[PDB]
From a paper:
Here we use the crystallographic structure of [name] at 2.5 Å resolution to reveal that this protein can accommodate four acyl chains. Ttg2DPae adopts a mixed α + β fold with a highly twisted anti-parallel β-sheet formed by five strands and surrounded by eight α-helices. It exhibits a “decanter” shaped structure never described before for any other protein family. The structure presents a highly hydrophobic cavity between the β-sheet and the helices that spans the whole protein and has a volume of 2979 Å3 and a depth of ~25 Å. After the first refinement stage (AutoBuild), without any ligand added, clear density was visible inside the cavity that could correspond to four acyl chains. We therefore modeled inside the cavity two PG(16:0/cy17:0), as mass spectrometry (MS) experiments suggested that this lipid was one of the most abundant among those found to bind Ttg2DPae when expressed in E. coli (see below). The four acyl tails are deeply inserted into the hydrophobic cavity, while the polar head groups are exposed to the solvent and make only few contacts with the protein. This lack of specific recognition of the head group could explain why Ttg2DPae is able to bind different types of phospholipids. Indeed, for the second group (R. solanacearum and E. coli, one diacyl lipid), this helix has a straight conformation, covers the α6 helix and does not participate in the cavity, while in the first group ([name] and P. putida, two diacyl lipids), the α8 helix is bent towards and over the α7 helix and greatly enlarges the cavity (with additional residues from β4 and β5 strands).
Author numbering: 23 to 212
């Protein structure tokens, strides 16, 4: 069986080489890029675990499985809509998966990497992995010190309090949280 390090390295190599070979077709049709993303990342992403992680048990247990699913989709689709093109504009950059001692039989692990971009500007990116029945999957992403999972966890709680714990209202507006997540991170970084 593979280790979380290999699952990361393999996914990075597969996705980057796939984008490089088809960079022209994706720039012309983003729906093709979105499909390839779902095909490559889908198997290695714990979408339901991430959704529940952002909602917290306090709110997920007030939601139906059909509702949690609809929250996954708004999350996925909005992430691709506002941050999918980023994988095309700068796929010329370098990535380095840093060492790790995690074994395949482990139940949890964190895999760190570095992204050298624009003349060598390095930001760390970390992936919190969890070993499930379907193998190792991403459960959280930390970027340059910003716990993205906790960021959305806080935004979800703030929006739920404003909507008087209306899940439907929160889901119908979650696209706007994702769209602003980048500046939300920049402000929290300065
Ligand atoms: C169940 C279904 C699963 C499917 C889910 C779909 C998920 C969608 C994926 C969305 C990807 C997010 C990219 C970050 C966007 C960003 O942040 O916006 C530009 C950035 C800002 O930075 P910067 O401050 O320079 O520019 C800002 C100026 O506006 C200031 O003026 O820059 C860049 O382009 C850097 C891009 C480099 C990223 C490439 C790294 C490797 C790729 C991601 C894969 C690896 C995944 C492996 C998974 C493990 C199993
Ligand atoms: C439900 C489905 C989930 C699917 C999960 C799939 C995993 C995909 C993993 C994608 C990793 C991409 C990392 C590149 C970002 C970057 O290289 O950008 C740095 C800059 C900060 O550094 P700067 O301050 O610019 O440094 C400059 C000097 O300071 C000058 O002085 O931009 C930023 O802020 C980055 C932060 C933007 C926030 C958007 C988050 C979207 C992203 C897709 C993930 C989230 C997945 C869900 C998480 C829930 C647990």
């Amino acid at each position: 069986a593979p280790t979380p390090q290999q699952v990361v390295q393999g996914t990075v190599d597969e996705l980057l080489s796939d984008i490089k070979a088809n960079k022209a077709a994706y720039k012309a049709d983003p729906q093709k890029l979105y499909a390839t993303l779902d095909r490559i990342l889908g198997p290695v992403v714990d979408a339901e675990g991430i959704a529940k992680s952002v909602m917290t048990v306090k709110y997920s247990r007030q939601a139906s499985p059909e509702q949690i699913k609809r929250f996954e989709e708004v999350f996925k689709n909005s992430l691709m809509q506002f941050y999918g093109n980023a994988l095309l504009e700068y796929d010329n950059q370098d990535i380095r998966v840093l060492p790790s001692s995690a074994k395949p039989s482990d139940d949890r692990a964190s895999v760190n990497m570095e992204i050298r971009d624009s003349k060598g500007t390095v930001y760390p990116v970390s992936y919190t992995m969890t070993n499930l029945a379907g193998g190792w999957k991403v459960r959280n992403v930390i970027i340059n010190g910003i716990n993205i999972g906790k960021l959305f966890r806080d935004q979800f709680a703030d929006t739920m309090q404003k909507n008087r714990n209306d899940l439907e209202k929160t889901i119908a507006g979650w696209g706007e949280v994702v769209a602003k997540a980048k500046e939300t991170a920049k402000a929290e970084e300065a």
